[PDB]
Every structure is written in C-alpha cells, then in structure tokens.
Amino acid sequence: SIDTPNYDVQKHINKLCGMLLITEDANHKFTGLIGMLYAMSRLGREDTIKILRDAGVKANGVDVTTHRQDINGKEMKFEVLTLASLTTEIQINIEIESRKSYKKMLKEMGEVAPEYRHDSPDCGMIILCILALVITKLAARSGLTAVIRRANNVLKNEMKRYKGLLPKDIANSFYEVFEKHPHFIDVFVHFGIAQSSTRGGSRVEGIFAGLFMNA
C-alpha cells in the first residue's frame, strides 16, 4: 500500500514542511517523502492514482487524528496524519523539536512574523523548489554540488527566512526518494506541469515555475 492524500490534508502537510524549515540543524531524512506527500495533496487522490496506474497501486486514505503522548513528564495532544510511509513517532518528534526552535526564536526577536513561521502558506512550495532542481539534474547524481549552488542563488530570500532550509540535506532526501521510489518522478513531473499552467500567484510559486521550466 502507498499513501494517497487528498486536498483536505494539504494545509497540514504544508505545516509539516514548515516545522522542518524552522528547526535549527533539522534532520531532513523524511523531507523527500513529505515533499512528495505535499505535491500529491495538491493533485488530489483521484489524479495521483490515475498517474500511477497510467504509468504502469493500493491507495491509502489520509485523515487527521489526535495522538496523546507523554513529553517532559506530562501527556500532550498532537495533530497527526494517518500514513504508512511515516509513523506517528516520526511526525510527533518533528513538532516538539520545531517547538524548541520556535521557543528559541521567540527569546531572540519576540513574537515571530508570518513569513518566518511554520504555518506560512509558502513552506511546502519552498521544499518543492529543491526537488525541482534535483529533477533538472536527473533528467540531463554527480550534479548534487550544482543544486546546492543554484538553491543559494534563487532561494536566497527564503534561506534567509528559514534555519532548516539546508539545501544539501534536503536535495539528498529527494535524490534518495526518487531513486528508492521512481514512481514519485512521474508524480512530480505531472505536478509541475499543472503548476506552471498558472499565470501568477506568489513569489515561491513563481520561482518553482521558472525552475521547473529549466529542466
């Protein structure tokens, strides 16, 4: 079975991406998967299945639940996604460690600005810009060093916004996720085609569109 998220969880997957982007020295092991989860939630359940069946699937339903876990001696509640490719243990640990980082940011500059927060609507698309680069290198794996050099150029402002935007750590998760699941490549190519078929929007959506076309 494989996780097929619909539109309903797209906002939750974006907050997952953002919690990673705000974490100081973030573990980007699951970033390659979460990025693909976000692009799937943008396509929907029906589309993701259609792409994977046409390419040549056991569709898993993704809904939000409440898991009660004990942290620092007391039990706490957390919003988690029903995923087979990502455990609740992995999901909860991204949150508490992003909370420690937010707590640290708060001690430095008081209450955090929308564009520096994990719940910013850009987060998931910022991540997708890294794999748009990784796809551009695979289409034409030694090109890792050029993805890092490109990410510093076009994602300068965004890298200035988030401490967890570590291109090397992120790019590598997509390289690995595309190698260990080649079906995500077809998912992402379809995603970016439907995405570059929008004549405006946001700055990140604008960098993604330009980066995707380069490939």
Dist. CA 98–CA 18, nearest whole Å: 9
Dist. CA 200–CA 76, nearest whole Å: 41
What is the Rg, in whole angstroms, of the alpha carbon atoms belonging to the chain? Answer: 17
Method: X-ray
Nearest to 126 by CA among 97, 101, 155, 169: 155
Structure-block tokens of residue 199: 């004549």
Nearest to 44 by CA among 208, 175, 151, 194: 194
Beta-bridge partners for 4: 61
Nearest to 91 by CA among 16, 162, 3, 1: 16
Whether 17 and 32 have beta carbons less than 8 Å apart is answered as: no
DSSP state of 79: E
In 3-state terms, what secondary structure has residue 4? strand
